Design an enzyme around this catalytic site. Structure first.
Site, PDB file in Angstrom:
ATOM      1  N   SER A  89       7.008  -0.027   5.834  1.00 20.91           N
ATOM      2  CA  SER A  89       6.335  -0.507   4.633  1.00 20.91           C
ATOM      3  C   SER A  89       5.048  -1.199   5.047  1.00 20.91           C
ATOM      4  O   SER A  89       5.054  -2.033   5.960  1.00 20.91           O
ATOM      5  CB  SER A  89       7.233  -1.452   3.823  1.00 20.91           C
ATOM      6  OG  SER A  89       8.422  -0.778   3.430  1.00 20.91           O
TER       7      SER A  89
ATOM      8  N   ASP B 156       1.743  13.546  15.553  1.00 19.71           N
ATOM      9  CA  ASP B 156       1.837  13.675  14.104  1.00 19.71           C
ATOM     10  C   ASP B 156       0.445  13.724  13.482  1.00 19.71           C
ATOM     11  O   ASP B 156       0.195  13.132  12.424  1.00 19.71           O
ATOM     12  CB  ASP B 156       2.683  12.550  13.495  1.00 19.71           C
ATOM     13  CG  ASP B 156       3.148  12.867  12.070  1.00 19.71           C
ATOM     14  OD1 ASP B 156       3.573  11.932  11.357  1.00 19.71           O
ATOM     15  OD2 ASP B 156       3.072  14.054  11.661  1.00 19.71           O
TER      16      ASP B 156
ATOM     17  N   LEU C 215       0.810  -1.212   0.000  1.00 19.33           N
ATOM     18  CA  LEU C 215       0.000   0.000   0.000  1.00 19.33           C
ATOM     19  C   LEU C 215       0.845   1.264   0.000  1.00 19.33           C
ATOM     20  O   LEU C 215       0.423   2.284  -0.556  1.00 19.33           O
ATOM     21  CB  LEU C 215      -0.935   0.020   1.208  1.00 19.33           C
ATOM     22  CG  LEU C 215      -1.944  -1.126   1.226  1.00 19.33           C
ATOM     23  CD1 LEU C 215      -2.871  -1.036   2.427  1.00 19.33           C
ATOM     24  CD2 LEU C 215      -2.733  -1.115  -0.076  1.00 19.33           C
ATOM     25  N   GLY C 216       2.021   1.227   0.607  1.00 21.72           N
ATOM     26  CA  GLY C 216       2.878   2.397   0.621  1.00 21.72           C
ATOM     27  C   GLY C 216       4.006   2.197   1.598  1.00 21.72           C
ATOM     28  O   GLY C 216       4.033   1.235   2.376  1.00 21.72           O
ATOM     29  N   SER C 217       4.957   3.123   1.539  1.00 25.53           N
ATOM     30  CA  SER C 217       6.109   3.074   2.421  1.00 25.53           C
ATOM     31  C   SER C 217       6.592   4.493   2.654  1.00 25.53           C
ATOM     32  O   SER C 217       6.304   5.403   1.875  1.00 25.53           O
ATOM     33  CB  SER C 217       7.247   2.204   1.849  1.00 25.53           C
ATOM     34  OG  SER C 217       7.979   2.905   0.851  1.00 25.53           O
ATOM     35  N   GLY C 218       7.347   4.662   3.734  1.00 27.75           N
ATOM     36  CA  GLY C 218       7.799   5.982   4.135  1.00 27.75           C
ATOM     37  C   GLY C 218       8.463   5.912   5.496  1.00 27.75           C
ATOM     38  O   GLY C 218       8.935   4.849   5.914  1.00 27.75           O
TER      39      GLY C 218
ATOM     40  N   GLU D  10      -5.943  -3.344  11.843  1.00 26.23           N
ATOM     41  CA  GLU D  10      -7.251  -3.360  11.195  1.00 26.23           C
ATOM     42  C   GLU D  10      -7.204  -2.554   9.900  1.00 26.23           C
ATOM     43  O   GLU D  10      -6.507  -1.538   9.811  1.00 26.23           O
ATOM     44  CB  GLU D  10      -8.306  -2.778  12.142  1.00 26.23           C
TER      45      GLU D  10
ATOM     46  N   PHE E   3       7.147   5.761   8.175  1.00 23.44           N
ATOM     47  CA  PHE E   3       6.354   4.828   8.969  1.00 23.44           C
ATOM     48  C   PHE E   3       6.668   3.352   8.675  1.00 23.44           C
ATOM     49  O   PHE E   3       6.073   2.475   9.312  1.00 23.44           O
ATOM     50  CB  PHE E   3       4.858   5.100   8.724  1.00 23.44           C
ATOM     51  CG  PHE E   3       4.484   5.136   7.256  1.00 23.44           C
ATOM     52  CD1 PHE E   3       4.441   6.340   6.559  1.00 23.44           C
ATOM     53  CD2 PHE E   3       4.196   3.962   6.571  1.00 23.44           C
ATOM     54  CE1 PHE E   3       4.109   6.372   5.203  1.00 23.44           C
ATOM     55  CE2 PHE E   3       3.870   3.985   5.210  1.00 23.44           C
ATOM     56  CZ  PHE E   3       3.826   5.191   4.527  1.00 23.44           C
TER      57      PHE E   3
ATOM     58  N   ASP F 153      -7.386   7.900   2.617  1.00 23.19           N
ATOM     59  CA  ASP F 153      -6.892   8.769   3.671  1.00 23.19           C
ATOM     60  C   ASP F 153      -7.368  10.202   3.415  1.00 23.19           C
ATOM     61  O   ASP F 153      -7.792  10.561   2.311  1.00 23.19           O
ATOM     62  CB  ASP F 153      -5.358   8.657   3.839  1.00 23.19           C
ATOM     63  CG  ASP F 153      -4.542   9.350   2.734  1.00 23.19           C
ATOM     64  OD1 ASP F 153      -3.478   8.791   2.394  1.00 23.19           O
ATOM     65  OD2 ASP F 153      -4.894  10.453   2.246  1.00 23.19           O
TER      66      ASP F 153
END
Ligand SMILES: C[C@H](C(=O)c1c[nH]c2ccccc12)N1CCCCCC1
Lengths: 9, 273
Positions: B19, B135, B12-15, B89, B17, B96
């Site tokens: 992966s 954040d 779904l994404g990475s950053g 969950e 936070f 978002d």
């Protein structure tokens, strides 16, 4: 006008 | 075993936070999100019951996992040699709040009121449970589009809530308060209220008010969209330069602009379906 995400961590 | 309890899907994404993968719990086909965090990137560590050493993010999620709320629920976690894996969950369908605002533009005040109210309840929940998120931003808010419910994610910059000064910060700079920019000092609740003023402006104007340090500390809020005087007032109050001039959470939710909020289901039917 440029809307953008901003990093954190 | 972790690979036998969950079917892993696409990234779904990475950053900052980690992966995050889409996933499904095999036992009940529950949709989940699978977050991987490298041990070398974890700055703050904690200990839980039985003193097992885990990332602070796991500690904070466990403290707010109590029941149902506007916070993402941690279902499970695992330690691997070089990483921790967090099972979260996953609402479906979901978007978002950053992408939502990008696609919709500035939100009608009725919709911003409903969203902002739910974020306030979520943040109150975190603070009640001893957790400071640090954040808060539209990127860190998921919208359950069918239920009309908002969920806070990504506690990896958070901390235990305390009443003394914070002198470290790893959240998003354009949502951080001027006392952090100027003095590298802030207190938890007043810094959170500042980021909520940034978020509310973001909702009603279609983008955040400030990009540069000089704007954050300058103390001028120019409104680029038509926004009611009551909402402008609440925003400017949250963005008071002096932290002690900012409203408490109670004063925010008692503000005249915040009255007569829609229910989550009404919000979905009127604005999301
Ligand atoms: C999309 C994305 O980047 C997500 C980050 N944390 C999540 C948790 C559940 C579902 C989606 C996400």
């Amino acid at each position: 006008r440029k809307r953008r995400r901003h990093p954190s961590g | 075993p972790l690979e036998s309890q969950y079917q892993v899907g696409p990234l779904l994404g990475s950053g900052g936070f980690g992966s995050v993968y889409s996933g499904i719990r095999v036992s009940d086909n529950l949709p989940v999100a699978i977050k991987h965090v490298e041990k070398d990137r974890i700055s703050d560590w904690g200990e839980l019951p039985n003193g097992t050493r885990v990332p602070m993010e796991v500690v904070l999620l466990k403290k707010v996992s109590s029941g149902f709320s506007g916070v993402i629920r941690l279902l499970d976690w695992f330690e691997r040699p070089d990483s921790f894996v967090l099972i979260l969950e996953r609402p479906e369908p979901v978007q978002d709040l950053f992408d939502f605002i990008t696609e919709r533009g500035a939100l009608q005040e009725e919709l911003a009121r409903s969203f902002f109210w739910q974020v306030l309840e979520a943040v109150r929940h975190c603070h009640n449970c001893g957790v400071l998120h640090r954040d808060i931003k539209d990127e860190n808010i998921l919208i359950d589009l069918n239920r009309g419910e908002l969920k806070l994610i990504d506690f990896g910059s958070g901390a235990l809530l305390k009443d003394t000064v914070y002198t470290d910060f790893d959240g998003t700079r354009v949502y951080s308060p001027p006392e952090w920019i100027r003095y590298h000092r802030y207190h938890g609740r007043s810094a959170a209220v500042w980021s909520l003023g940034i978020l509310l402006y973001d909702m009603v104007c279609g983008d955040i008010p400030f990009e540069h340090d000089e704007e954050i500390i300058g103390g001028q809020v120019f409104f680029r969209q038509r926004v009611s005087s009551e909402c402008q007032h609440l925003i400017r109050w949250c963005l008071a330069l002096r932290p002690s001039d900012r409203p408490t959470f109670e004063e925010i939710q008692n503000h005249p602009w915040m009255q007569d909020v829609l229910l989550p289901q009404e919000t979905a039917e009127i604005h999301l379906h």
